[PDB]
Amino acid sequence: GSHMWIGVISLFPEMFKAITEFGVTGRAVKHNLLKVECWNPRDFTFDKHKTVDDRPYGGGPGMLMMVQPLRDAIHTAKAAAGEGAKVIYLSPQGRKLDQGGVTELAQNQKLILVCGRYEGIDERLIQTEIDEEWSIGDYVLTGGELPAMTLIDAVARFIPGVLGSFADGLLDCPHYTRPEVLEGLTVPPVLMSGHHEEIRKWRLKQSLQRTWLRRPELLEGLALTDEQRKLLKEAQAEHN
Amino acid sequence: GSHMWIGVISLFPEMFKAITEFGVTGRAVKHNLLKVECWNPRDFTFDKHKTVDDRPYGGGPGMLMMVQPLRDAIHTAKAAAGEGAKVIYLSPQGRKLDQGGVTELAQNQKLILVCGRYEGIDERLIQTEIDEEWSIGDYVLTGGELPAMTLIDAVARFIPGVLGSFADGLLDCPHYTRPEVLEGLTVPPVLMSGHHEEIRKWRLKQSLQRTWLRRPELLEGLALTDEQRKLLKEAQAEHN
Ligand SMILES: NC(=O)c1ccc(NCc2ccccc2O)nc1
Ligand SMILES: NC(=O)c1ccc(NCc2ccccc2O)nc1
C-alpha cells in the first residue's frame, strides 16, 4: 500500500541482513511492505584490486571513499529508483535525527542511503549527488551502515501493516508483566484494578513525571493539555 | 591490551554478525581486541513453544519481554563476565548517548548490553538488574539491537589498535580527493599548496564555520582557543 523502497550504497551490503532477515523489519521485507536494495561501489571499480578508497588532498592520516566507484554506484541506484527518490548521506555533520524527523523522512516513498566509510566522501559529491545530510546522533562510528539501518528501522515503523508514548512527546511510562511480585517488588495496584480510566491517568502521570525528572527540556517543547498540566503538578507535588 | 568484552542479551543474536564479521569492528573481533558474546532468552525458556513475551498488567496493545527467560539470560551473562561488568539497557528513556558519553563507556573493560523487544522490559528488572539506561537518540526502533551495535561500534574505536574532528568538539571540515575538478567544482588551492600550516588553519577555520552555521549550540559548549576565536571571527566576517 504505502510501501517503501530504500536503495542503499554500501561497501558492506551483507550488514543489512541484520534488518532484512530478522524481526519486524524482516517481516516487512518478506511481506513486500519494505524493499531494501543495495549497490556496492566495489562492483563499480575497474582496477585489478578493486580499489574503493583514495587519499585526501592536503594530506592527513585518513582515507576517503574513491569518487569514481562511489559516484557510479549512486547513479546506478538513482536510475533504478526513477523519479522522486531523495538521496540521503549519513554523517555526524548532518541534521540530527529525532522522531519528528523520522516521520518527515517516512513521507518519502523512495530513499537512497549513502553509507560512508573511512573519513567519508568528497565534499563535491555531497553538493552534486546528496539531497539531505542526516545524523543519528552526536557520536562517530566506523561507517554509515548502522546509521542507515537505524533510519530504515525507524521509518519502517510508520509503514502501515508493519506494526501489529513518544507520539505525544513524552518518555514512556513504566510497564509491568508477570510475576506479581519480583524480588520483593510489587506491581502498582492500579494496574490490577481493571479500572481503565484510572490506569490511563496513572500511565500519563508517570510519563509526565519521568519526562520531568529525566528529560525536562522535552517538556518545554510541549503545549500541555489541561489534564497533562494537572497530573504533572500532582507529580511534582508528590516528589516534593 | 586494553581489550574489551561485551556481553549481549538478544532475541536476535545473528544481527550482531553485522559488526562481528565486517569492516573495522570485524577486524577488531578477529584480532581479539573486541569480544562480543551473545545470550538468547529463547534458550532459557522451558515451555514447548519457547515463549519469550508476556502481557502487560493494566492492559494495553503491546507485549513485554517475558521476565523469567530474560532474567535467567542476564544472570548467565553476569556469571560469565565475572566482577566489574556494567549492565546497560538500551531504551529511548535512557541517558542520551554522545561522544563524551562514548568515551565514558569505553572506560569499562566489560559491558553487558540488554536488548529490549516489543514494548520493552519489566520496570522491576531495570531496578534489580540494570546499572545504566542509555539512548542512542530521540527516536523509537523495533529493538535494542541496532542501538547496542551502534554503542559497540562507537566504543570499539577507542580500543587501542582498532583504528589504523569531533575530538575538540567541532564538526569535521570538508574533505577532497581525486579528481582535481569534479563537475566544474575544483579543490581549494590551499589543499594543493603543500603548505602544512596553512592547510591546518584552513581546515580548522572550515570546521569552526561549519559548526557555527549548522550546529551553533555546540560552539556554546566550548572554550575556544585564541586561534579558534580568531578564525571563527574571520569566517563570520566573510559570511557577512
Ligand atoms: N552520527 C552518525 O549518524 C554517523 C554517521 C556516519 C558515521 N561514520 C561514517 C562516516 C564517518 C565520518 C564522516 C562521514 C561518514 O560517513 N558515524 C556516525
Ligand atoms: N533510542 C534508542 O536508543 C532506542 C532503544 C531501544 C529501542 N527499541 C527497543 C525498545 C522499545 C521501547 C522500549 C524499550 C526498548 O528496549 N528503540 C530505540
Which stretches within chain B are classed as H helix?
Answer: 17-20, 23-30, 67-81, 99-105, 123-129, 145-156, 196-214, 216-220, 226-239
Nearest residue on chain A to B155, alpha-carbon basis = A141
Method used to determine the 3D structure: X-ray
* CATH-assigned architecture of domain B1-165: 3-Layer(aba) Sandwich (3.40)
Domain boundaries, chain B: 1-165, 166-240
- In A, which residues are within 8 Å of B60 by CB distance? 175
Distance CA B155, CA B110 (A): 12
In this structure, chain A runs to a length of 240
Distances, alpha carbon A113 to alpha carbons A5, A7, B34, B142, in Å: 11, 6, 28, 19
Distance CA A188, CA A209 (A): 16
- In degrees, rounded to 5, the angle at the alpha carbon of residue A63 between the alpha carbons of residues A58 and A64 is 90
- In degrees, rounded to 5, the angle at the alpha carbon of residue B95 between the alpha carbons of residues B92 and B96 is 75
**Could you tell me what percentage of chain A is helix, strand and coil, using 3-state DSSP and rounding each to the nearest 5?**
45, 20, 40
Q: Note the maximum CA span of chain A.
A: 71
Q: Among candidates A98, A200, A162, A169, which has minimal Cα distance to B139?
A: A98
Give nearest CA residue, ligand 2 atom 9. Answer: B143
Starting at the edge strand found earlier in the chain, the sheet holding A4-9 runs: A34-39, A4-9, A110-115, A86-96, A132-135
- In A, which residues are within 8 Å of B209 by CB distance? none
Q: Among candidates A210, A5, A154, A195, which has minimal Cα distance to A87?
A: A5
Q: Among candidates A54, A45, A150, which has minimal Cα distance to A94?
A: A150
Nearest residue on chain A to B191, alpha-carbon basis = A58
- CA of residue B83 relative to chain centroid, distance: 24
Give nearest CA residue, ligand 2 atom 3. Answer: B135
A113: its cell numbers = 542511503
Distance CA B237, CA A26 (A): 51
Distance CA B10, CA B44 (A): 12
Across the interface, whether the CB atoms of A67 and B190 are under 8 A apart is answered no
Give resolution in angstroms: 2.1
Across the interface, whether the CB atoms of A55 and B171 are under 8 A apart is answered no
Residue type, B30: K
B36 sits in which H/E element = strand B34-39
Quick one: residue B161, left, alpha or beta (phi over 0 = left, psi -120 to 50 = alpha)? left
Closest chain B C-alpha to A80 CA, distance in angstroms: 22
B137 labelled as ligand-binding? Answer: yes
Q: Among candidates B205, B175, B206, B202, which has minimal Cα distance to B190?
A: B202
Distance CA A234, CA A232 (A): 5
Specify the pairing of strand A181-182 against strand B132-135. Answer: unpaired
3 state SS of A129: helix
Give nearest CA residue, ligand 1 atom 8. Answer: A143
A207: its cell numbers = 510519563
Judge residue B220's burial from the number of C-beta atoms within 10 Å of its C-beta, 0-12 exposed, 13-18 middle, 19 or more buried: exposed
Nearest residue on chain A to B212, alpha-carbon basis = A93
Closest chain B C-alpha to A226 CA, distance in angstroms: 23
Binding residues of A for S-adenosyl-L-methionine: 89, 116, 136-141
Please tell me if the domain spanning A1-165 has the same topology as the one spanning A166-240.
no
Q: How many CB atoms lie within 10 A of CB A49?
A: 6
Residue type, A120: G
Fold of B166-240: Trp Operon Repressor; Chain A (1.10.1270)
Helices A145-156 + A23-30 axis angle, to 10: 70
Residue type, A208: L
